[PDB]
Structures are given as C-alpha cells and as structure tokens.
Amino acid sequence: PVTINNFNYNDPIDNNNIIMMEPPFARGTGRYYKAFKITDRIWIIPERYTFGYKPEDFNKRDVCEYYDPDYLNTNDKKNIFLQTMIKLFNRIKSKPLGEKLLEMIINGIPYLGDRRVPLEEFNTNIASVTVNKLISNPGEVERKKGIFANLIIFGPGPVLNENETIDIGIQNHFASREGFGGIMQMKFCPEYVSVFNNVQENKGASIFNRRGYFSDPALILMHELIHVLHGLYGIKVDDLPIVPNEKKFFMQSTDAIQAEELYTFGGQDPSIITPSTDKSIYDKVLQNFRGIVDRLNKVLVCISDPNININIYKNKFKDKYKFVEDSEGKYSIDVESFDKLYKSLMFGFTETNIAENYKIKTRASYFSDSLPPVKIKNLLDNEIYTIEEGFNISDKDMEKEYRGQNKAINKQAYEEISKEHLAVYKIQMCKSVK
Amino acid sequence: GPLGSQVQLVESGGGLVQTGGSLRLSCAASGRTFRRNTMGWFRQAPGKVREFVAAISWSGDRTYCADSVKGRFTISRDNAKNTVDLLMNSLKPEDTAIYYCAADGTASVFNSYASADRNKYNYWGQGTQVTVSS
Ligand SMILES: [Zn+2]
C-alpha cells in the first residue's frame, strides 16, 4: 500500500521521483528546487525553509531556540537529511497505525479548487492544488507542468528545533480550514529534538527521583503529520485559542493554546475545551463538508485541464469524505459515515495515541514547558536508533521504562549543545514548586 | 508562566469617524511581557472571518501589513510601556470593523507570512469598535 522510495541527493533529475519543483509559495516565480518523491504525493525538498524570513534571520539569546546557518549547506548534508527522512518514514510505516496515517494522508487529496472557484467547476490552477515541475530535457524546449501533490517537507527555518506544519491562505481564507483541503508544507529537523519532563512518574516525586527525556523524531514527525491530515481534509481548526483558567493535574504550563494543537495532541488536552466549543467545531466541519457535497453535485468541468476526468475525481472525493450517493447519482452526507470519519480525523490519530502504540515516551500534555533541545548523535546508526524500536532498543536493554529516551541513561544517543543548555536543564529538573 | 486567563490585552482608541479621518488604536498588555514576541492587529466585520491588518516584530525592525491598508495604516510598538499601536489614516467606510490586537506568546522569529495568520496568535484582546461613516 505505501512504498517509501530510495534515492541519493546527487542522483540525476528524472522528471519522475526526482524533479525540479516550484513550491506553492513560489508559484509563478520560477524558483525551483530539487525535490524527491518519498511516497505517492509526498515530497522532500532538503533545503532550509525561507519563505517569509530574511537571510539575516538564519545567523546567531534563548537556549530553547537553536540556530545554525550552516545546516543543509552542502550536497552531502542534504543527502544525510534525505536518508534520515527515509528512515523516519520507514519507522512510521512499521506499525499499522502509522501506515494508516500515511494512507489517509496520501488518499486525502485536496479538493480541486477552493472558495474562489464556482460551484460547477474544478480548478487545478491554484497553489493549494498543484505545484509546477520544470522539464528541461536536452534538445527540447524547456517547459513547466503543474502536478498534484499533498505534502512537501522542507528542512528547518532559522530555528532548527521549531518544527511546524503550514497551510496556504489567500485573502484571509485557508482551503485547509474550509473543507477543501490544500497542499500542506512542513519545516522539519530530525536531529535537534525536544526535551520534556512533564511525565506522570514525576508527579509527587522527590526532586532527585525525577526523570527527563528526549523525543523520538519519528513521533515529532507523526505529530506534524496529524496537522497535515487535518489540513488535507480541510478541518484544521481556525482561530480558536483555548485559554486555561486553572492548572489541571496533567498541565505543567497554562498558556493559551490553539484548539488545533489540543486535538492533535490528544490525551487529556481536549478535556479542557467546553462542550459548546467542541460542538461548534463538529458543526463547522459538517457545514464545510455540506459545501463540498453540493459542489460535487454541481461540478461539470475542469477549467484548467481538459485531461482531468470529472467522474473519476467526483468518486475520489466521494471516497475521501465518505459521502453516499442515491439511485440518481446525487451525493449526500450520511450522518453515521460522517461521525465515523470525523472521529477518525480528530480523535483517531493523536500524538498521545501514536506514542502509546509505538512505545515511545511522550509529554503528558501539550501544556508542557519549553526545555532546551539536544542533538541526536547519529540517527542513521542502528546502534543508536532503529526503524523498529527508535531509541528504545530491546537488545541494548533500552526498551524497559523507555530508558533509551531517558537523558540520565542513554547518554550515547545525544549531545548537549552547550554547557549553558545543560545548566538550564538542570535547573528545571531540580526546581521545587510550592 | 501565568494562567492564560491572567493575561490581558486591552485595545482602546476606537470610535466613530467621518470618511477620510484618522484614529489611533492602542493595545496595552498585562500579565506577562511580550518584549520578545510578534504582535498584530486584525479586524472583523459582521459575518466575516478575523482579517489580518498589520504585524510587527519584537524589535520593530520588521513590519507587515495587508495590501488594502498599506500606506494608510502604521503599526508601532513601545516595549517599555507594553503597548502596540495602529495609526489609521484616510479611513474609509470599508474599514468599519471590530479591531483586535493579538500576541504570539511564543518568542519565535518574525515571519511575514506567519504573521498574517490568526492561528499564530494565542492571546487576543476583546476588541475596539471602529466605525467610518460617509
Ligand atoms: Zn503541533
């Protein structure tokens, strides 16, 4: 079902899995990047993420924000990034739950249009539906061809450890938040991983019995892929800060957080959302899906590509949104189908669920303090990190109690960035709250 | 850090003006500092989404604003006084809306694209009404 492709950064462009791609925010600019199709619809561009930054932002005040302007600055570094992403995707598909996540992402193709598109119309000529591919075959006229895609993963922006998933907005509307879905993008760094100490076993523990852990970058990635899934199905939660008025037992921090993060994390985090707000979220998805089902009952033409088969795409979307059709061919929402799909998209894949299923230690809440990141020594070394078990390798006795992620135990696996990073961590681990 | 509910952004300076007039909105933050944080102004008209107006980096060295207000609206900030201001000149009826000031409570590098996204802000004021009549 899901095949992870193999390639080396210096392999030649083949206009198939290795292409020159103009990413969505560069639509029409002619800025192309060497891009690698790691699986159907998913691309890796092993370049720093630069859109909306300035070049000086990448140079040189906060131990929780790590900068390195030289990350990815050679072809070999770009190759290391590609091989690491391949390994992480193989780890994701090594269990059924992450395989299912990838299948849902691949099959969750953006609708062919957005709110600007007439109801009767399929428009592929927009940045949230296609990216341009440059074709430069020797002895031929150079040309560009728009292709479909679902996700493009870049390397990091200025701060290596600030991974983020990004949707496309136009004139204050995001197709990824309005039922249609849209090409999703990510800035991701596998080696500079988060650290956390908001875990149940520290609750009531004496200071010197507290444990702190570093994250498995496959879980970091799968957390981001849940945001991707929401944005491909058009249900990323729009403009909804959730403001705690009390510190629950699983919370370490109490800052306001977007609801999109709380559902993506799972565990206990949605429990602080009011029933009223939770119901508004459900009603919005339903209203937006009703818009899509009405579009499918009207669509007659693809205005941007006379090779698109309308009936093939109508049925792809019928399946994506789990619509039903009557004897006459009219589509509609079936409430039972809708609730099942909604529950899978919003509650079926969470950071907490995935961590438990992969036996990866995670934080007890998205409401967790920022701690300094650490650098993994070498994710490509199977003595440190494997597809099957991540850091928590049985044959090293690192599976027990997630010892392979415990900063006080698996010191072979990671490096502190500086003495100041370590000192800050030690303060956080030793501190008494009254 | 404080309970999210102890953080307050208070916008002020809204009112009624005639077409062509000017207002200066201001937002005072309390309950935590935002001296290393991007701040922005948004506006919401009846029946519409919260629309980006303008944003400003923590140092003021990087501002961004919507095309429809460029040249007429200026955002500025005074970190010592915990304020962010929006000077609105050449107001038109189309500018009528509730204006909101918003803070990105995570201290991260200003990005002009991210700064236009309401989801990148976790603290919001209750808004100040601006009405422009012909
Ligand atoms: Zn997230």
Residue numbers in the entry:
A (entry chain A): 2 to 61, 68 to 441
B (entry chain D): -4 to 129
What does the published report state?
All BoNTs have a catalytic light chain (LC), which is a Zn2+-endopeptidase that specifically cleaves neuronal SNARE proteins and is mainly responsible for BoNT’s neurotoxic effects, while the heavy chain (HC) mediates toxin attachment to neurons and delivers the LC into the cytosol. Here, we aim to develop single-domain variable heavy-chain (VHH) antibodies targeting the protease domains (also known as the light chain, LC) of BoNT/A and BoNT/B as antidotes for post-intoxication treatments. Using a combination of X-ray crystallography and biochemical assays, we investigated the structures and inhibition mechanisms of a dozen unique VHHs that recognize four and three non-overlapping epitopes on the LC of BoNT/A and BoNT/B, respectively. We show that the VHHs that inhibit the LC activity occupy the extended substrate-recognition exosites or the cleavage pocket of LC/A or LC/B and thus block substrate binding.
All of the most potent VHH inhibitors were members of the same competition group, in which JSG-C1 represents one of the most potent inhibitors of LC/B identified in this work. The binding of JSG-C1 to LC/B buries an interface area of 1063 Å2 with a high SC score of 0.721. The binding is mainly mediated by the long CDR3 that folds into a loop with a helical structure at the tip. JSG-C1 binds to a pocket close to the active site of LC/B through extensively electrostatic interactions involving 21 H-bonds and 3 salt bridges. More specifically, D112 and K115 of JSG-C1 form salt bridges with R184 and E171 of LC/B, respectively; Y108 of JSG-C1 interacts hydrophobically with F26 of LC/B, and R113 and F47 are hydrogen bonded with N179 of LC/B. Prior studies found that all these LC/B residues involved in VHH binding are important for the catalysis of VAMP2 cleavage by LC/B. Our findings thus suggest that the binding of JSG-C1 to LC/B occludes VAMP from engaging at the cleavage pocket of LC/B. Structural studies predict that the JSG-C1 binding site on LC/B is highly conserved (only 1 conservative amino acid change in B4 and B5) and the JLJ-G3 binding site is identical across all BoNT/B subtypes. Binding studies confirm that both VHHs bind effectively to both B1 and B8 subtypes.
